[PDB]
Amino acid sequence: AAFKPEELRQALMPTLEALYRQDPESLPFRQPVDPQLLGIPDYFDIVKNPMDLSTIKRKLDTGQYQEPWQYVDDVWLMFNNAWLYNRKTSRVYKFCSKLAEVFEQEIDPVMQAL
Ligand SMILES: CC(=O)N1CCc2c(c(Nc3cccc(C(=O)NC(C)C)c3)nn2CC2CC2)C1
Incomplete structure (x- = not known):
């Protein structure tokens, strides 16, 4: 099937907005990781x-x-990176897990519909 950009945006953007709406949990994910700013070379x-x-x-x-x-x-790549890098007890790992839980809840019905 061919998917038009507008169809994808209408269907998928609410699932991305659901991640942004998680506060504080989306905060480490809103911009690319900057190892120099964060002191993690x-x-x-x-x-x-x-x-x-x-x-x-x-x-x-x-x-x-x-x-x-x-x-x-x-979206999964973003989560997988954070689970790989951050320690299990860390804030950012747990924030990742929250976003991943929200994402699966949102994306499942959307993908079924297309
Ligand atoms: C997503 C990812 O894996 N990151 C690597 C670890 C990482 C990332 C960030 N980025 C970031 C950027 C902005 C806000 C936050 C944040 O957690 N704020 C809370 C205290 C509410 C975090 N902070 N950290 C932890 C810092 C190095 C000690 C981004």
């Missing part, structure tokens, strides 16, 4: 393929996804 030794909400938002806004599993893949 080993970050890219661990995380090879960075992703964050702003990047995903821009891709949706500008029609860069052809089909919805591409969007799902980027």
Whole structure:
């Protein structure tokens, strides 16, 4: 099937907005990780393929996804990176887990519909 950018944005943007609405939990995910600002220069030794909400938002806004599993893949990549890098008891790991819980709840019915 061919998916138009407007269809994807209408269907998928509410699921992205649901992540942004989580406060405080979305705060570490709203911009690309900046290891120098954050004082964690080993970050890219661990995380090879960075992703964050702003990047995903821009891709949706500008029609860069052809089909919805591409969007799902980027959201999951963002979560997977944070679970890999951050320690289990850390704030940012737990914030990731909250976003992932919200995302699965939102995305399941949307993908069923398309
Ligand atoms: C997403 C990710 O894995 N990050 C790496 C770890 C990481 C990231 C961020 N970014 C970030 C950026 C903005 C706000 C926050 C935040 O947690 N604020 C709360 C105290 C409400 C966090 N903070 N940290 C922890 C800092 C290094 C000790 C971003």
